[PDB]
Amino acid sequence: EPTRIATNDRLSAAVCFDALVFLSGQVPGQAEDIHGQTREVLAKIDALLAEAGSRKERILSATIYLKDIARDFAALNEVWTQWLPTGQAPSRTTVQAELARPSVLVEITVVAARG
Amino acid sequence: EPTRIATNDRLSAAVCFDALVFLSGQVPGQAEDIHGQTREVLAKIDALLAEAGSRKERILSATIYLKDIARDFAALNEVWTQWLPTGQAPSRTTVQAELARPSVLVEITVVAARG
Amino acid sequence: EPTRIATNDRLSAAVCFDALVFLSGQVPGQAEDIHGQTREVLAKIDALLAEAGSRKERILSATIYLKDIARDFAALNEVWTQWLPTGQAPSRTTVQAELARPSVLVEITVVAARG
């Protein structure tokens, strides 16, 4: 009964099952700086929630991976707090981890509620 | 239909949806050592499960982040195994990651079942 | 209402709740190389999905932890893409993290749908 969105032989961008939406970790576009990269990740999450039948106000959890948490946490929080729908922040966890490409400073993995 | 617990402009400590509870990653209080910090994280999880309508016996998954997994895994396991309700350990994953503040040695992210 | 599979005082290999299956992070057997270790992790996930009432075609999410993401991502992807049931890739996130034992190059944490 799972439904899949934008599937290739490595991943589906989203998997939907019983009112839950599981998004693949989202990475930036071509932005090179932490502020722009966080903005681009959040834009991609915005678009995928739409395709998977959810929306920003229905995020349940987000794991935020930063390549350098000491250097970039403050910038991440600036963009994140401005993006979230007012009064509707999800649960979150922010940790340091290198991502699959060295240029990536931030990656975010979301679970959300359909609706 | 999500419900939120202890929300600010960065995160909600918990988000509840369809009998699931999603907790933000929990960090220690003022303890400075791994044993005490793990005890404090688990105390905070205990209290949040209560507010979100769950309990320790209903944990589904826990990601345990250690700043130094080689150094501190044994201590983490001592405190963890003593804290868990008998015979009711959840699924878990323990990995190394630097946390948002350098003093933090351990952070734990829980999903639990309402009830 | 959770059900547990293969429980000890540290973890349950799986916890089942309301049509969801939460697997503990799975680690390799005795393989020493990234290709073999990834194969062994995926074999273990295969077996646990079976015991927990799911199957590979019903994976919802996978966090893939690599000890060295720059060195080993390509090998991970070779084994992963060949293992997945055709056209049915789950959501995934791949990040770098040291695992609990230094010989472990890869660990994978799965959530799946019962059925």
UniProtKB/TrEMBL annotation, chains A, B, C:
Superkingdom classification of source: Bacteria
InterPro entries the record matches: RutC-like_sf (IPR035959), YjgF/YER057c/UK114 (IPR006175), YoaB-like (IPR035709)
Protein name: RidA family protein
Species of provenance: Pseudomonas aeruginosa (strain ATCC 15692 / DSM 22644 / CIP 104116 / JCM 14847 / LMG 12228 / 1C / PRS 101 / PAO1)
